[PDB]
Paper text:
Among the most important sources of epigenetic silencing in humans is the Human Silencing Hub (HUSH) complex, consisting of three proteins: Periphilin, TASOR and MPP8 (11). In the current model of HUSH-dependent repression HUSH spreads histone H3 lysine 9 trimethylation (H3K9me3), a transcriptionally repressive mark, by recruiting the H3K9 methyltransferase SETDB1 and its stabilizing factor ATF7IP to existing H3K9me3 marks via MPP8, which binds both H3K9me3 and ATF7IP. Here, we report the crystal structure of a Periphilin-TASOR minimal core complex and identify the key physicochemical properties of Periphilin necessary for HUSH complex assembly and epigenetic silencing.
The structure contains two Periphilin molecules and a single TASOR molecule. The Periphilin fragments form helical hairpins with a mixture of α-helix and 310-helix secondary structure. The TASOR molecule forms two α-helices that wrap around the outer surfaces of the Periphilin dimer. Unusually, however, each Periphilin subunit binds to a different TASOR sequence (residues 1014–1052 and 1072–1093, respectively) with an identical binding surface. Notably residues 1055–1071 of TASOR, between the two Periphilin-binding segments, are disordered, but these 17 residues could easily span the 35–40 Å trajectory needed to connect residues 1054 and 1072 in the Periphilin-TASOR complex.
Numbering used by the authors:
A (entry chain C): 1014 to 1054, 1072 to 1093
B (entry chain A): 295 to 366
C (entry chain B): 294 to 367
Write the structure that this text describes.
């Protein structure tokens, strides 16, 4: 159940190493410092509309 | 030289964007799996292809920044 | 209108913006997942619906919490 995290971090590592190969190759420059990713604090309009109605209902009941 | 600053700046930008794409894909996929556990293994292929291809476009984006910059 | 009506209305608007953001993000990610492995279309869609529903309900709970807090301490 860390498979997804392990996957995403592995992708990010491969990416940042390829970024470093490019920077070194052409040419020089220095060390990046973006932290590694972290995971903690079709039509979708039907869900938006459903929410909008439940909330209007609540509001009305509230007065 | 003088340019070193500019390249480093765009590289930080791109890394930040890619890092975000990563955090988002993983959060969504974890929640999908939370609801449907049989996805945990099989979804990895689609996650990995997406993140690999996005990675390359980001990489490509940096190269075409270098090449354009060094044109004069 | 009342301070309190305005507070509820704004809280509602904020929750809806956050929810819209989450729905569009879920939908974007799932669309790319399915483009890459279409055999997953049905189960991913299902899990999508589950998530958007549960988050929907939490939004509803959030608004009730706000009203209840406001009407017990103002």
């Amino acid at each position: 159940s860390e498979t997804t995290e392990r996957t995403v971090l592995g992708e990010y590592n491969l990416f940042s190493r390829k970024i470093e190969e490019i920077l070194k190759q052409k040419n020089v420059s220095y060390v990046s410092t973006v932290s590694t990713p972290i995971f903690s604090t079709a039509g979708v309009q039907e869900f938006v509309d459903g929410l909008h109605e439940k909330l209007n209902t609540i509001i009305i009941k509230a007065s | 030289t003088t340019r070193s600053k500019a390249i480093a700046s765009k590289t930080k930008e791109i890394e930040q964007v890619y890092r975000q794409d990563c955090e988002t894909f993983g959060m969504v996929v974890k929640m999908l799996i939370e609801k449907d556990p049989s996805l945990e293994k099989s979804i990895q292929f689609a996650l990995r292809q997406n993140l690999h291809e996005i990675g390359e476009r980001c990489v490509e984006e940096l190269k075409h920044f270098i090449a354009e910059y060094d044109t004069s």
